[PDB]
Design an enzyme around this catalytic site. Structure first.
Site, PDB file in Angstrom:
ATOM      1  N   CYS A  63       0.701  -1.253  -0.099  1.00  0.00           N
ATOM      2  CA  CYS A  63      -0.041  -0.032  -0.039  1.00  0.00           C
ATOM      3  C   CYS A  63       0.919   1.316  -0.049  1.00  0.00           C
ATOM      4  CB  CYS A  63      -1.355  -0.021   1.101  1.00  0.00           C
ATOM      5  SG  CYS A  63      -2.260   0.881   0.857  1.00  0.00           S
ATOM      6  N   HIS A  71      -3.425  -5.446   0.813  1.00  0.00           N
ATOM      7  CA  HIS A  71      -2.829  -5.607   2.044  1.00  0.00           C
ATOM      8  C   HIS A  71      -2.576  -7.157   2.552  1.00  0.00           C
ATOM      9  CE1 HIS A  71      -3.684  -1.320   3.200  1.00  0.00           C
ATOM     10  NE2 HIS A  71      -2.757  -1.536   3.726  1.00  0.00           N
ATOM     11  N   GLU A  90      -0.946  -8.637   4.594  1.00  0.00           N
ATOM     12  CA  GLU A  90      -0.742  -8.701   5.864  1.00  0.00           C
ATOM     13  C   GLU A  90      -2.189  -8.587   6.914  1.00  0.00           C
ATOM     14  OE1 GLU A  90      -0.593  -6.098   4.236  1.00  0.00           O
ATOM     15  OE2 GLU A  90      -0.650  -4.333   5.537  1.00  0.00           O
TER      16      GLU A  90
END
Ligand SMILES: Nc1ncnc2c1ncn2[C@@H]1O[C@H](COP(=O)(O)OP(=O)(O)O)[C@@H](O)[C@H]1O
Ligand SMILES: [Cl-]
Ligand SMILES: [Cl-]
Ligand SMILES: [Cl-]
Ligand SMILES: [Mg+2]
Ligand SMILES: [Mg+2]
Ligand SMILES: [Mg+2]
EC number: 6.3.5.3
Length: 1286
Positions: free
Chosen positions: A1126, A1251, A1253
């Site tokens: 990002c 994302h 994560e």
């Protein structure tokens, strides 16, 4: 070559920027001009930048500044033509853009740059036009509340004028008597009562000196009904009978009855309840390493409103509503951590141009406020901008429209929301020994943490800088993360009254006085008077007390975060408030605290009951079919996507249940669920209940229903004991409007003394806003629009297992649908969506029919949830059973076959009543056991078998052998989508809005679906982890980044030791990249994305030659690995010159939608050298997206083909059919060929916009296949990294 001219003591540089408007925005402007008969042939707009310099730039610095100010999408540049209109912030104001851009300049070593500001130069060709029409053109191009229009670029010099400090002014009481206070009260707009004037007259006559304005202003805030809550502490007499309890005491009754699990109520900003013992993941002060810390994560909750400012300027009104509530959370106890948010709007009818609905009538409005449409266009964007840029996910909310002429308690009158409800709330986590505040030591330093003040508290036009608040939160986090060594003795948010409220409250709460120095307070406006400095409502500030000996520690913490702060006073044993001014060598304030904090008597409210007679619904024009159509078009009922996808729902990595449900991502989730930590299945739930229109018929029933619906919305979450659920009660009313006062008392009693004690529900927090009405002159006539009494209940709870939450997503396996009708067949139609859409109020509303049965319902739901006996749940609320069943069919993308013969002969009333209850779906084989289970809780006669969910597109309602209603589910689904379509269409790129809407009509859409090229349960890192050798990863962050903790957690699961590396650590030499074999640049909003997302971060690297060489060195080593996600992808794309094999990388620019996109998007992994994607090529799975500037932009077609041919594209958005797409929102940002990740030739560096994560845990995927274990596919990226390092 840029302009450079004298500007007082300084020089002002004028730099040309880039085109400011996309084609569709240009076309929108031209259409507005055509529609107002302003003959404008063409319009072109360009950003212009203004730099106020305190000393010259050399050639190199100049080229640096110029480069800083290149950003944004590469739009069509034009040679200027026609008339110039320059739009800038109002003189005397400093834009948030200015604050952020000036920080960037400073961090790139441009200390000569005193301030940067921006405007937009419009070039308008319209060779006709009178000067009257020029003012009309100018009106169209700026916001009168915050901007001004100038005819010359050089008029921008007025933005940087430095006024000399204005002195304190006394009010000459001794020289004029009481008339001086009267004059001052009118001049300063203090709105003081007569007896307050008496109090101040006596106090100052007693002291023998004239009051300063500052002392009167300060007293006026600390005593206004609002801050003092006079109505809620009042004695009441009702219908001639004295009442024994204040409204506040009645709310407190709920805590007296149910103290269970409560740790703090009515003694802080936020209430605190018990949470769960979990691993809290954060970076240790000593090592900088992220570690799990096993401890209780207790739960704080708070809800606030910001109603009047939103009526005036909705964007900052909403944004600062959120910002203020976030500060209350952070300042709970001795520091705490906001986790997730909720949002509420109530407004009048939207009257969307070209989409008028039959119940809507234009009644006019005051000229000084904006329309309901502008509130719902700009306000949600403001609240979301704050939440997104601060970094808290916004997971639940409500949105109601109401505006009608009704025969209510005071007869026929206009009832609505011209003054809107703008509600913001949330939950956070807090450590056990920080729930209590300390006991202020004498000589404690008294500190203002956060932004330099300006003259803000035009006076209802707020201003937000969420990145400043993020920087302050990081400090507060460092403080509470020190446990027993936390240096914060006491902390308080700065809100209403500015410092004049906050600092006295800080020292009071700690039993002390304070002495303060005015010239120590950080100021961006040297002209301000002592009154303005002390009392302005500038945002993003906190006050706190720290021991003198901890000041070096506090200073170190603040500097590393780049959070400004000032020691501005000391705590005194003497309980006196002193403010001194070093500039004018005098003392603006010198008062005992008891004098200042002095109560006039309490209020007595002597009132009488008004009660409307209902009128039975006139059904002459109502059919069931027409009613279904109308109801689905009521914005209250209708799809809410425009309020949901504008706001991040994955930031933190702890979101288990967001609004969007199922493979089709339909926003119908009844409550929000977060995990307690990054390693737990315990969690927190949030729900909302509200039913204002009911209060137009029955005050007490409207309150009971608000409570009831909060419970029905939360009920299919695994909680257990109802006493775990804690409520905030926010009361909105037009106090003094006839009947509202008695109704208020009766509603508070109905919940505080009766329903909540009997259910075992505590209300440990709450707020009130008591002037919910608007008056103006329309004809020769006075007009008034008055709100219904509007109780909003927010429910918060500890969750036992987040995995066991049910949603409205119907299964089509063999099933039974059962209605739980807590209305007991009353089927009331008064004050329903049905009534509203035929312009009526109707007769009797719903109500809690049976308290034991409501508790029984909750308990039974909890038993079914825990035993895994439900397939689905959706409660009944606006729009009734009809809407509940329709929404479940939308979410399931299937049909229903139901029979309503058992629900009464009145089919309209059975379908459209809004009584409490809902529909459970169970496996057909469990139907008898579920019915017996419900029977055990007293519910047998309330439970009705309806039928079943079936594959297909048929939505069918029968009564015996008669068809009551039958339609295409797709048709209904598209009708229900029309409001969000039309909103998105007028607010965003209409092409995107249309694409999104049209995709809903395609029943063949199979929804999000996965294909895996590898085994997602195989831990390929396990052999490495098992050796106990854990390589470091530099988890890189800059000021304003927000998603650094969950990035660390992902790498930690794969076997890394994650290190917290701030850019301030690299700059101070505390960390060197030479010690790492892996780096990751995290997401979020560095510098608020000012000067282009990622650019300030990149250019702060590039322009500091030592740190730059360090990055370059890292990337040129033979085995180093880097990931950018990002903001970090954006950053690293701006750092290309340091990264080998990055020559073909694109830029990432504003989404084609022109809107932030928080989506759960389908991607495929494509063939590239990327080492982090090894083994995953050909996989397709959804991933969290959260960005405004994710669109891949290439320098021309040649560069796109070259990138493609080189084979460096690593992820692509696909549609649900599995095909690469550029259609929105399947591709959320308009990236060509779906491109959303790229790698270098060697595969060692990979950058991506989504994302991974945020979704490495299966539990944090909004939708996922049922058979997955704890790991999602995305876990494999981090494991691939571990294994590659070997
Ligand atoms: N103002 C808002 N901001 C964010 N989400 C919202 C807002 N209003 C409603 N929502 C969400 O949209 C979905 C539909 O809302 P609504 O129909 O009002 O809920 P319900 O009828 O279950 O109370 C829910 O998930 C809700 O949280
Ligand atoms: Cl041109
Ligand atoms: Cl699937
Ligand atoms: Cl240096
Ligand atoms: Mg609803
Ligand atoms: Mg609901
Ligand atoms: Mg609701």
């Amino acid at each position: 070559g840029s302009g450079l001219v004298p500007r007082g003591s300084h020089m002002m540089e004028i730099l040309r920027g880039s085109p400011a408007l996309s084609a569709f925005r240009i076309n929108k402007l031209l259409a507005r001009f055509q529609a107002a008969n302003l003959q404008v042939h063409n319009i072109y707009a360009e950003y212009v930048h203004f730099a106020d310099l305190n000393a010259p730039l050399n050639d190199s610095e100049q080229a640096q500044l110029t480069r800083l100010l290149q950003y944004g999408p590469a739009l069509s540049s034009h040679t200027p033509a026609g008339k110039l209109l320059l739009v800038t912030p109002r003189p005397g104001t400093i834009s948030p853009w200015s604050s952020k851009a000036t920080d960037i300049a400073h961090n790139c070593g441009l200390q000569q740059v005193d301030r940067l500001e921006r405007g937009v130069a419009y070039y308008i060709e319209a060779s006709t036009l009178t000067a009257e029409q020029w003012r009309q053109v100018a009106a169209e191009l700026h916001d009168r509340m915050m901007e001004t229009v100038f005819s010359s670029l050089t008029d921008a010099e007025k933005l940087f004028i430095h006024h000399q400090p204005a002195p304190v002014s006394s009010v000459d009481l001794l020289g004029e008597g009481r008339q001086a206070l009267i004059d001052a009260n009118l001049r300063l707009g203090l709105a003081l009562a007569e007896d307050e004037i008496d109090y101040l007259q006596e106090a100052f006559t007693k002291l023998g000196r004239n009051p300063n304005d500052i002392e009167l202003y300060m007293f006026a805030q600390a005593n206004s009904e609002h801050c003092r809550h006079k109505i809620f502490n009042a004695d009441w007499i009702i219908d001639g009978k004295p009442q024994p309890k204040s409204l506040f005491k009645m709310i407190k009754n709920t805590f007296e009855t149910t103290p269970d699990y409560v740790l703090s109520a009515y003694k802080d900003n936020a209430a605190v309840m018990e949470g769960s013992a979990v691993g809290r993941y954060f970076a240790d002060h000593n090592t900088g390493r992220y570690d799990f810390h096993q401890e209780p994560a207790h739960i704080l909750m708070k809800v606030e409103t910001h109603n009047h400012p939103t009526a005036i300027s909705p964007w900052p009104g909403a944004a600062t509503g959120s910002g203020g509530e976030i500060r209350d959370e952070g300042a709970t106890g001795r520091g705490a951590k906001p986790k997730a948010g909720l949002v509420g709007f109530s407004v009048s009818n939207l009257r969307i141009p070209g989409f008028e609905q039959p119940w809507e009538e234009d009644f006019g409005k005051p000229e000084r406020i904006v329309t309901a449409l502008d509130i719902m266009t700009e306000g949600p964007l403001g609240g979301a901008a704050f939440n997104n840029e601060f970094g808290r996910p916004a997971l639940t909310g409500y949105f109601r429209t109401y505006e009608e002429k009704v025969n209510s308690h005071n007869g026929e009158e206009l009832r609505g929301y011209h003054k809107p409800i703008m509600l913001a709330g949330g939950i956070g986590n807090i450590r056990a020994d920080h729930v209590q505040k300390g006991e202020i030591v004498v000589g404690a330093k008294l500190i203002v943490l956060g932004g330099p003040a300006m003259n803000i508290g035009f006076a209802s036009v707020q201003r937000d800088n969420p990145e400043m608040e993020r920087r302050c939160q990081e400090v507060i986090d460092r403080c509470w993360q020190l446990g027993d060594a936390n240096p914060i003795l006491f902390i308080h948010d700065v809100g209403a009254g500015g410092l004049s409220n906050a600092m006295p409250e800080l020292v009071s709460d700690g039993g002390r006085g304070g002495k303060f120095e005015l010239r120590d307070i950080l100021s961006d406006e040297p002209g301000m008077s002592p009154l303005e400095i002390w009392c302005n409502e500038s945002q993003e500030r906190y006050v706190l007390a720290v021991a003198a000996d901890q000041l070096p520690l506090f200073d170190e913490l603040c500097k590393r975060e780049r959070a400004p702060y000032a020691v501005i006073g000391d705590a005194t044993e003497e309980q006196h408030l002193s403010l001194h001014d070093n500039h004018f060598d005098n003392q603006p304030i010198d008062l005992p605290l008891d004098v200042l904090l002095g109560k006039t008597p309490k209020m007595t409210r002597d009132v009488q009951t008004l009660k409307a007679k209902g009128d039975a619904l006139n059904r002459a024009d109502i059919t069931i079919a027409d009613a279904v159509k109308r109801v689905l078009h009521l914005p209250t009922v209708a799809e809410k996507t425009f309020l949901v996808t504008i706001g991040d729902r994955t930031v933190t990595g702890m979101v288990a249940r967001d609004q969007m449900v199922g493979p089709w991502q339909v926003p119908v989730a009844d409550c929000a669920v977060t995990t307690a930590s990054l390693d737990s299945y315990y969690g927190e739930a949030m729900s909302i209940g509200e039913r204002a229109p009911v209060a137009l018929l029955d005050f007490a029933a409207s309150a009971r229903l608000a409570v009831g619906e909060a419970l029905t919305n939360i009920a299919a979450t695994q909680i257990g004991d109802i006493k775990r659920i804690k409520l905030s009660a926010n009361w909105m009313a037009a106090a003094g409007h006839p009947g509202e006062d008695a109704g208020l008392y009766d509603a508070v009693k109905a919940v505080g003394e009766e329903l909540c004690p009997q259910l075992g529900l505590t209300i440990p927090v709450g707020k009130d806003s008591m002037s919910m009405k608007t008056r103006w002159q329309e004809g020769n006539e006075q007009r008034e629009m008055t709100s219904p009494l509007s109780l909003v209940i927010s429910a918060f709870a500890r969750v036992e297992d987040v995995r066991h939450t049910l949603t409205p997503q119907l299964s089509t396996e063999d099933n039974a649908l059962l209605l739980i009708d807590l209305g007991k067949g009353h089927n009331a139609l008064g004050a329903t969506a049905l009534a509203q859409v035929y312009r009526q109020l109707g007769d009797k509303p719903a109500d809690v029919r049976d308290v034991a049965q409501l508790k029984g319902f909750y308990d039974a739901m909890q038993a079914l949830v825990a035993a895994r006996k439900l397939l689905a749940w959706h409660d009944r609320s606006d729009g009734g059973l009809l809407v509940t069943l329709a929404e479940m069919a939308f979410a399931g993308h299937c049909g229903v076959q139901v029979d309503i013969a058992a629900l009464g002969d009145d089919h309209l009333a059975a379908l459209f009543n809004e009584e409490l209850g809902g529909v459970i779906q169970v496996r057909a084989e469990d139907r008898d056991a579920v019915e017996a289970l419900l029977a055990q809780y007293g519910l047998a006669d309330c439970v009705h078998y309806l039928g079943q969910a079936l594959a297909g597109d048929r939505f069918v309602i029968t009564a015996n052998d008669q068809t009551v209603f039958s339609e295409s589910r797709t048709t209904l689904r598209v009708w229900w989508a029309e409001t969000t379509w039309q909103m998105q269409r007028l607010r965003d790129n209409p092409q995107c809005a249309d694409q999104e809407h049209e995709a809903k009509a395609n029943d063949t859409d199979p929804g999000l679906n996965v294909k895996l090229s590898f085994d997602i349960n195989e831990d390929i890192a396990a052999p490495y982890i098992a050796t106990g050798a854990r390589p470091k990863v530099a988890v890189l962050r800059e000021q304003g980044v927000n998603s650094h903790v969950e990035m660390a957690a992902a790498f930690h699961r794969a076997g890394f030791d994650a290190i917290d590396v701030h850019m301030s650590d690299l700059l101070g030499g505390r960390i060197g990249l030479g010690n790492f074999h892996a780096l990751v640049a995290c997401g979020g909003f560095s510098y608020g994305d000012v000067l282009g997302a990622g650019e300030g971060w990149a250019k702060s690297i590039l322009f500091n030659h030592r740190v730059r060489d360090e990055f370059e060195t890292f990337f040129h080593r033979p085995q180093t690995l880097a990931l950018g996600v990002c903001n970090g992808c954006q950053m690293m794309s701006n750092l290309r010159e340091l990264i080998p094999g990055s020559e073909l990388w694109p830029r990432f620019v504003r989404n084609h939608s022109d809107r932030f996109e928080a989506r759960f998007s389908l991607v495929e992994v494509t063939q590239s050298p990327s080492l982090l994607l090894q083994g995953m090529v050909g996989s397709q799975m959804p991933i969290a997206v959260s960005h405004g500037e994710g669109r891949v932009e290439v320098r021309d077609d040649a560069h796109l083909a070259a990138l493609e041919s080189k084979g460096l594209v690593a992820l692509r958005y696909v549609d649900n059919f599995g095909k690469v797409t550029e259609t929105y929102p399947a591709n959320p940002n308009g990236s060509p060929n779906g491109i959303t990740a790229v790698t270098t030739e060697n595969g060692r560096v990979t950058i991506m916009m989504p994302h991974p994560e945020r979704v490495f845990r299966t539990v944090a995927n909004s939708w996922h296949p049922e058979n997955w274990g704890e790991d999602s596919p995305w876990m494999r990226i981090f494991r691939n990294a571990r294994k590659q390092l070997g």
